[PDB]
Write a protein that binds this DNA or RNA. Structure first.
Lengths: 51, 50, 50
DNA sequence: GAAGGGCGCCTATAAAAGGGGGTGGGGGCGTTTTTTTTTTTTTTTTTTTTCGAACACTCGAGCCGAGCAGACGTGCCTAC
DNA sequence: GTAGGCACGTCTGCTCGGCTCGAGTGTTCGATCGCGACTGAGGACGAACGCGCCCCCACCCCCTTTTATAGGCGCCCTTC
């Protein structure tokens, strides 16, 4: 299951205008992860206004 | 018959696992390793060496 | 296997995954052109991957 | 009968010449058939988690078009 | 000049042929984690095979007899 999965997604990558596109240069997302943030720099937070 | 035999030998040269067809063998009885088999699996050129 | 091959990616990528000879035979027969734009084709070819 | 003894043929060498015979060397036919009804067996049939679709193919089926035939309508001939 | 009746034309529906549809059956593909790391399988590798035996041909050999020379031995016959 892991080998098959990597084999699909391998060529997707964030380009220098920050839209995420695969090998034939089709757009996957307009911004990576819909906000353009990094996954190792995020944290869990509480939203005050749902009070 | 010669054409049928030639057609078989050149086919078995390229691909030796043809469905419904006998397979090429040796005195050992081992199936021949044709070019498709060499490419095909985990131990094949595409994945194993390349 | 039967879905990834419907993608409009270059033929050499599709060979690197389970289809081996068969996708190359069809690629040769249609005469498609592989633009070496993706990660696998470039690593197999040996030039610095993008 | 069993056993030991005596007589005689055996193989080698030679060397020739005519003719029958053998093991080939190579090509042929690829049979068809005689049956023995066969080693081609059931591998494991599965012990299953089996597909996993995709694609080709099967077979049937229903809508639709043209032609045909009768009913309805029109066109043509005869009699007062 | 005019009206009624027989044949032909018009219209609609039934039958046949033509065109496209799927549940079903078939094929047929495929992969089955990573790595190891050991030997040692090192004797093979028994299968080689006739495939099926067939005829034509080519070439070499066996086939008698001579005589001397000698072990090896098969057979007959008398004695045990």
């Amino acid at each position: 299951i892991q080998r098959r999965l990597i084999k699909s997604m391998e060529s997707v990558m964030v380009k220098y205008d920050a839209t995420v596109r695969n090998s034939i240069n089709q757009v996957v997302q307009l911004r990576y992860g819909e906000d353009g943030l990094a996954g190792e720099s995020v944290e869990f937070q509480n939203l005050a206004t749902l009070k | 018959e010669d054409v049928k035999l030639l057609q078989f030998h050149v086919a078995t040269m390229v691909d030796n696992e043809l469905p419904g067809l006998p397979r090429a063998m040796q005195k050992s009885g081992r199936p021949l390793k044709s070019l498709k088999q060499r490419l095909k699996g985990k131990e094949g050129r595409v994945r194993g060496n390349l | 296997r039967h879905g990834v091959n419907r993608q409009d990616t270059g033929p050499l990528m599709k060979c690197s995954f389970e289809e081996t000879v068969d996708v190359l035979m069809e690629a040769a027969a249609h005469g498609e052109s592989d633009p070496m734009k993706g990660v696998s084709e470039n690593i197999m070819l040996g030039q610095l991957a993008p």
